[PDB]
Symmetry: C3
Subunit: 116 residues, 3 copies
């Protein structure tokens, strides 16, 4: 009956759990400068937060994927994304263009998942 939080700072919590649902903050890349690397890094951060929250990649319910330049980077995003997903178990998905908080960030992904 109470939300619980993982990795809280003054602006956000990396994850909020409520009953059987896990809400992740939008994840941004690490040090990669290129789209492939950055997508890999975002997805790695998501996989770790899912684990910490009692979920897993197979239990993702929805992902919204924000690309700084969707025309330029959609193909690379899809390549890395499809490799990362568990086979036959893709979530619902929406991919749109949006500038992110820093101009060097090319990709940000926000996930909602089911706790196990």
């Amino acid at each position: 009956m109470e939300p619980t939080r993982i990795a809280t700072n003054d602006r956000l919590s990396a994850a909020v759990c409520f009953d059987a649902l896990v809400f992740l903050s939008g994840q941004v890349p690490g040090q990669a400068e290129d789209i492939h690397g950055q997508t890999r890094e975002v997805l790695a951060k998501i996989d770790a937060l899912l684990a910490e929250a009692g979920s897993r990649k197979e239990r993702i319910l929805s992902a919204t994927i924000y690309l700084k330049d969707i025309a330029r980077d959609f193909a690379a995003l899809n390549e890395v994304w499809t490799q990362w997903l568990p086979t036959g178990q893709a979530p619902s998905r929406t991919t749109v263009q949006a500038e992110l908080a820093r101009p060097s960030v090319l990709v940000e992904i926000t996930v909602v998942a089911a706790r196990g």
Copy 2:
């Protein structure tokens, strides 16, 4: 306790169901080139997925509506949207501008709904 999926490909599932919730992938138009036609087509695709997932238009919980050109197309979007909705039963809604994966796509809508 397990998500189920409808129309899964290598990138996404058109719908993911979990308990009493239905998460739809962002729906894009069919063959229409114009905003009115494209909005009608997106909403038709949503109505079919709601049916397949055990929901209905009256049970939509939230919609995020992405317009390639919000200044240009907000009025047309609203015309078609309000016609399509069941009377007195509009969902929560957010409408923002975002380029979609192809430049010819003017509108994309992502819905979360309650299973019946």
Copy 3:
């Protein structure tokens, strides 16, 4: 087993409740023209809708924050946002750039929360 609605018009309901979840429509500012004022006003509108829906600021699960100009206004948004949040209880959050329905709107925030 049925969604309930708060403040329904022909396009949207300000809030939709379903079981223990509250889905708010994207909230836009009041009369403020500046980013600080507009953010304060959006957050005030959210706090009122949370109250009406049986929730509260401490029970927010996720927020998506849309900025017309993320480079310009991210710092001001964060200042007001962090002041408004209950201490140690920040939600999951995603902040991206998107033009809103009127050019004078600088900020719009969409919240999902847990009913108490």
